């Protein structure tokens, strides 16, 4: 049946790139996302980000830089409103109000959900265990927290992560000013996860590289000692284990390798889960630890601490963001 | 835009002087 031929071709593990049913949703969503992003990053006109008729120039042809270009977030006048190409009057207020950001975001988020499903799909069609999608769910949670969950919690898509390098930096600074993420324990876990995942990546790579079995000469790459699909183990787990154990103590070095790679998976994945969750609870304004005015002397005078100095810098950031847009002294979410 | 003039010619020799080197090395490997 033509339909059975189609379902064979979609779910085919013969394709150069696997499509599958998550990919038949994923490919058009990426098509729109990539098209509108490459279009807007280069040629979008300035966007009225905070709803106050102050266009922010975010695209590469409006006198702007690869570092400083951004698909500028959707206008604060819009908020969380669905603002597609057709609900605007024209193709120039839609560009002016930041519709391209919302179009890219509304196709990018489901495209990443479909990429995760597609990872599970191909794991199923190849007979391998199905949890690489679980590892991928950590950066996906992180990118949905700063593109969907923080705008929902704060009330506007202007509080989303700008699609640019300097826009991202701006998001970081404003977020620290308004939430003190550095003193958020989920973010300390995320930092431990990314820095320790880098530690453990460098550590595991240096250990496997250091205890390689001699197969080659000195005037050829050690990577030629491995043949793709060879059944023999290309390194010495015993030698790397003995080295690591002598380096710190006896019952420290993973003897096992399946446990070892589960730990390599688990450490940065779990910590990025936690830091995505931290962004998400700060979306409801559950901010980090607060230790201002916490150490008092005998009379009652506040002795400054280092958290006070961090506050003082965060207040520095706090009273400069969205300058012509706070008519009252209380910047709520 | 008051940009560096030679910033164009710095950008393109930074990225194609190594590139031709790689292609030289690749092509002589492939042949």
């Amino acid at each position: 049946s033509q339909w059975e031929r189609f379902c064979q071709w979609i779910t085919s593990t013969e394709n150069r790139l696997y499509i599958g049913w998550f990919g038949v949703l994923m490919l058009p969503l990426l098509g729109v996302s990539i098209t509108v992003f490459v279009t807007a990053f280069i040629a979008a006109p300035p966007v009225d980000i905070d709803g106050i008729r102050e266009p922010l120039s975010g695209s590469l042809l409006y006198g702007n830089n690869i570092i400083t270009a951004a698909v500028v977030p959707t206008s604060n006048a819009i908020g969380l409103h669905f603002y597609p190409i057709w609900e605007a009057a024209t193709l120039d207020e839609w560009l002016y109000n930041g519709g391209p950001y919302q179009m890219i975001a509304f196709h990018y988020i489901p495209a990443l959900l479909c990429y995760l499903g597609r990872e599970w799909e191909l794991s199923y069609r190849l007979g391998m265990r199905p949890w690489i999608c679980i590892a991928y769910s950590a950066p996906v949670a992180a990118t949905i927290s700063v593109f969907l969950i923080y705008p929902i919690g704060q009330g506007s898509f202007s509080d989303g992560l700008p699609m640019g390098i300097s826009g991202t930096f701006n998001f970081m600074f404003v977020f620290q000013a308004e939430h003190n993420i550095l003193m958020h324990p989920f973010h300390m876990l995320g930092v431990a996860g990314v820095l320790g995942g880098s530690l453990f990546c460098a550590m595991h790579g240096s250990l496997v590289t250091s205890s390689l079995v001699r197969e080659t000469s000195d005037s050829q790459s050690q990577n030629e000692g491995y043949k793709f699909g060879q059944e023999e183990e290309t390194y010495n787990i015993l030698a790397a284990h003995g080295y690591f154990g002598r380096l710190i103590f006896q019952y420290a070095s993973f003897n096992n390798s399946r446990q070892l790679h589960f730990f390599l998976a688990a450490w940065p994945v779990v910590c990025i889960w936690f830091v995505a969750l931290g962004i998400s609870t700060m979306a409801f304004n559950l901010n980090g630890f607060n230790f201002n005015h916490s150490v008092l002397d005998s009379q009652g005078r506040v002795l400054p601490s280092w958290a006070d100095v961090v506050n003082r810098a965060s207040l520095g950031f706090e009273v400069m963001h969205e300058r012509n847009a706070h008519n009252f002294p209380l910047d709520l979410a | 835009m008051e940009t560096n003039k030679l910033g164009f010619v710095a950008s393109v020799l930074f990225v194609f002087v190594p590139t031709v080197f790689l292609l030289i090395l690749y092509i002589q490997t492939a042949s």
Binding site: N65, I66, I67, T68, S219, Q220 | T3, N4, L6, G7, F8, A10, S11, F14, V15, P18, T19, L22, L23, L25, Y26, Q28, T29, A30
Partner: peptide
């Protein structure tokens, strides 16, 4: 032995050159 550069190394080298140049272009232009 003669020098090599296989296809994968060529692609890796091209991307590291191209992405590094895209990164430093904004600062060469200033």
């Amino acid at each position: 032995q003669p020098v090599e550069l296989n296809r994968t190394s060529l692609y890796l080298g091209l991307l590291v050159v191209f992405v590094t140049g895209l990164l430093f272009s904004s600062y060469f232009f200033n």
